[PDB]
Each structure stands twice: as structure tokens, then as C-alpha cells.
Design a protein around this ligand. Sequence first.
Ligand code: HEM
Ligand SMILES: OC[C@H]1O[C@H](O[C@H]2[C@H](O)[C@@H](O)[C@H](OCCCCCC3CCCCC3)O[C@@H]2CO)[C@H](O)[C@@H](O)[C@@H]1O
Ligand SMILES: CC1(C)[C@@H]2CC=C(CBr)[C@H]1C2
Length: 465
Amino acid sequence: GKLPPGPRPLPLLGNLLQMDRRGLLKSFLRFREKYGDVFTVHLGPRPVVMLCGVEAIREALVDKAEAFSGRGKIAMVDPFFRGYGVIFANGNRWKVLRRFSVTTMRDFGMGKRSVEERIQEEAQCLIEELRKSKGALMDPTFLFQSITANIICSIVFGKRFHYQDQEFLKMLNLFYQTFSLISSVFGQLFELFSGFLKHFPGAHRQVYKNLQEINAYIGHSVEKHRETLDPSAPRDLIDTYLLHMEKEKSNAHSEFSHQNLNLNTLSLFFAGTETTSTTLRYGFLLMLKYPHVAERVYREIEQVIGPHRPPELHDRAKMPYTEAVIYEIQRFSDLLPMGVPHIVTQHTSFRGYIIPKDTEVFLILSTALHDPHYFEKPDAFNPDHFLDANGALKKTEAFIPFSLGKRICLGEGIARAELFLFFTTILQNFSMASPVAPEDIDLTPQECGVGKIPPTYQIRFLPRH
Ligand code: HEM
Ligand SMILES: OC[C@H]1O[C@H](O[C@H]2[C@H](O)[C@@H](O)[C@H](OCCCCCC3CCCCC3)O[C@@H]2CO)[C@H](O)[C@@H](O)[C@@H]1O
Ligand SMILES: CC1(C)[C@@H]2CC=C(CBr)[C@H]1C2
């Protein structure tokens, strides 16, 4: 009749003393054992409704999109974004920014390269760089960040950066450290108690600072643009927004403001860069632990593509095994285990409960991705989770690592193309080795909070001969 049941809170502490020391997600999975798929947790002073399992999540995001489509807060970054840019925006602002971002991430103007071609050229730059590494050990993080950030960069700024550019590396380093800090134990505590903790020093200050330092670059670049801007020939997403800006300048309430410009652009870069490269980091750790899988992908690339012709999107249809392996990397690596917080926009009835306007809601995507009815032994890495008996690709409704409904990842098409083309292009040209034997490889995440972040590891890329 009223909110969903959950553990009884204490006045200021909420459900703190019921939480699990290992983190928010562990805490929530234990509540689920007792309360089932829909339950309430008080995270300090706020009740947050948790939805688990694909059936509840889809009922909320799809069948009740008119109520579950608002965006809630990530406390570690709210002080910085303040509801600006498409990820953190609500109401009419979200509408405008979403429609703008969807269009400009897609349509580039006549003469411009498709998404596919941008990724294919980046892949060849990447392959060249790995040949130049000559089998040396590395943590591949920076390169995985380079290649994915360069995709968004080519759309937003109209250029890419060189792998050697230390100033590019420095921004990549700030994205990496920020995503870890946000996912750390402190950042999960900050989620319960930011009203109190914000008054003291902490990781929330370092994140804020990191973000402003990336934002300073974008402001500058915005200005260089607004200086060379030719209304007949827009070069990129920044010009295109400058032109909407000029068109609506007589409306003081125009959503096309400078703050939206900077923070929308920062959002696309942060999301475009950290999500994919984190998935690739996990993916190559997985190939190190399961070399028979990597050997079998390579066999499929030989047969379908060959050793030299560059992979293309058209090849996916014919490579069920590799597609299954990429799906399973995404499913197992469970990048955003609780998704990104939503917030209900109107008073609503859910499975007999009433959820008032403005209640925060977490969609625990991890529970769809590890659902034992769709994935036998869901805690093990196994590409067979996505294959039928005939070795044809088996897609399923439990695979929602981009979420669903109105707020579904807007980068989904790009991300999928990058995973496929980067992963296949690398394996076409290199096998992998490392000093750690497969049975000693530890897949345990280095952080698990808003993001699930793999540990660091060294790898060698060996040219095939
Ligand atoms: C492995 C790759 C990616 C994953 C797993 C991923 C996952 C997600 C998830 C779970 C959400 C939250 C949706 C929700 O609130 O319900 C999201 C939102 C978003 N993602 Fe992705 N994303 C990925 C790649 C990208 C890329 C490459 C971009 C940029 C091109 C991107 C841009 C966004 C944006 C802008 C949102 C917010 C959309 C909105 O609130 O309207 N994502 N992503
Ligand atoms: O307010 C003072 C700030 O000014 C100087 O900053 C410059 C440094 O000259 C300059 O090296 C630097 O260039 C970085 C180029 C690489 C851009 C990478 C982009 C890729 C994707 C997302 C955005 C960043 O950007 C900063 C902003 O223009 C400094 O760099 C700063 O340390 C300083 O704090
Ligand atoms: C999950 C997101 C939507 C994407 C990656 C990490 C995030 C936390 Br700042 C946001 C940007």
C-alpha cells in the first residue's frame, strides 16, 4: 500500500548498521535475499527503492516509462554537474539535450566519415602503435582509453590526439582516477552521508578538482571554436551547438547555454571514454585467463575475415562466436552494477506499492546480468551463455548492460561497434601473453561501487606470423 518493505531504519543513520562492509551492491543483494525483487533502503536520509531482476526493471523502465524516466544523483559528482549536461539533466533540459546529443552523435554532415570509418582508422592507429611496442609488457589502460576517447573526440572536436601527447595522457589519467575515486568505499559512503561528509576533506574534493581541470580544456576549446566558427560549414558537435546557441540567444531561458555546452561535452567524454575502455581492460584480462577462448576467436577471425583485411561491422553476422565472447565480456564485467540512479517523476503504483514523486530508484542491472534462469552458473565467464546448441548466437532479454527505456545509453551503437572492431582488430594482429599463469589470474575487481573496475595487470601483444 505504501513504500516497499525493507530493513527498519534508524533516524539519522538510515540502514547503515544493516549494510555489508563490502559495499552497496553486496548490501543490496543481501536485502534481496530477504525481501525479494522490490524493496526500500534508507541511504542516510533518503529512501531509495531497489528493483532487481529483468522483470521488475523492464516493468519500470519500459511499461512505466512515464514515471521512471527521471535521473537521480550520484553524490560524488552532483556538486560538479548540478543537473547540467544530458546524463544528469531532468525535465525539458533533458529533452533538449538528449535530442541534440542523439542527432549530433549520429549525423555528421556531408563529407564526414561514418562512426564505422572513424573506429576503423583508430583501430589501424592502434595496431601500428602495438607493432611499435615490440612485445613489451604494459598496462594497456591508457591505450584503451586513447582509442575510445579519440572516437568521441573526432565527433566533438573534429580531431584525434596522438598516443604520445602527454597532455592527452594527463586528461586520460584524470578520467581514470576519477572513475576509481567515485567507485571507492569512500564514494559509496559519500552516497549515504554526503550532507555530513562534504564539510571534511576527502575524495569528493579530489573528484571535483579533477573534473574542473578537464572542464578548463573544454571551455578553452569552446572559445577557439566560437572564434573560427563558419555558420555555412560547421566542423563538429561543438560548432553545431554554437549555432543553436546563436539561434536562441534572445531567449534567456535557452537550454543551449555555456554551462550545458561544457558539461554536456564533459559528460559525453567521460561516458564515452571510461565505459568502453574499462570493458576492454576486463576483456583482455579475461582472454589472459581463458586463452582457449582467445584462440577460438582467432580461428573465427581467420575463417571469416582472414589475416589482413580490416574487420568491418558487416562481419558480425558471420562471427557468432566472437559476438558471444563480447556479450559475455559485458555480462561478466557488469560495468555499472546498479546502473545510474533514476528518480520517479510522478506518483505511481508499482506491484501494489505506492511510490511518491521524487523517490530515488536504483535498477540493479547486475541482477539481470547474473540471473541464473537466463545464464547457468552466472558467476563464471562462459561465452556459451550466448550460444545455442548449433553454435548460433543466442540473444536474450536479460542482457541489459546499457539499461532500457527513455534513458537507455545513448552511446550504445557506438560502444558496440568499438567493442567489436577494436577487439577483433587487435586479435587479428596479435596474440596475448603475460607473466601470470591463467590459473593464477585474479579477476576480483579493484573497486566495486558505481563502477566495477578490474585490477591492473601487465600484458604483451605478440605479432602473429
Ligand atoms: C560499454 C559501454 C557503455 C555502457 C556499458 C554504458 C552503459 C550505460 C548505462 C547503464 C547508462 C545508464 C542508463 C540509465 O540511466 O538507465 C548509460 C547512460 C549513458 N551513456 Fe552509456 N554506456 C556505454 C557507453 C557509452 C558511450 C560510448 C557513450 C558516449 C558515446 C555513452 C553515453 C551515455 C550517455 C550520454 C548516457 C546518459 C543517457 C541519458 O541519461 O539520457 N555510453 N550508459
Ligand atoms: O585555470 C588554469 C588552468 O590553465 C592551464 O591549462 C591548459 C594546459 O595548457 C594545456 O596543456 C592543456 O591542453 C590539453 C590538451 C589535451 C586535450 C584532451 C581532451 C580530450 C577529451 C576530453 C577533454 C580533454 O589544457 C589546459 C586548459 O587550456 C593548465 O593546463 C592548468 O594546469 C591550469 O589549472
Ligand atoms: C555511468 C555513466 C553514465 C558514464 C560512466 C560513468 C559515469 C559515472 Br560519472 C557516468 C558517465
